[PDB]
Amino acid sequence: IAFGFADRSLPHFTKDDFSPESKGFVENSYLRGLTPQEFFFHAMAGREG
């Protein structure tokens, strides 16, 4: 997931954060349910398809 905001993927993260959760790793299963940050990233990948 690209830095579509200035140096971050979403305004809920600090800048220059390259960790898994920051750049689109969805840790939860569909059973467990996705968090709000993960949800949007999943919708970005899904839209591209």
């Binding site: 960790s19 898994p20 790793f25 840790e27």
Partner: protein, 49 residues
């Protein structure tokens, strides 16, 4: 077991960030530092899942 394998994969991604930011990361042939960095993180996370 599931939660452990994901937890340990997030730690390895931290180590990769540390190495790349302290100039201790191996450069892959044909690739810049940032390409090599992005490449190694992706391989780790897909193997984790």
């Amino acid at each position: 077991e599931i939660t452990h394998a994901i937890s340990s994969a997030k730690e390895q991604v931290q180590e990769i960030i540390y190495k790349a930011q302290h100039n201790e990361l191996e450069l892959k042939p044909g690739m810049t530092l940032r390409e090599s960095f992005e490449g190694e993180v992706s391989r780790t996370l897909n193997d984790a899942r």
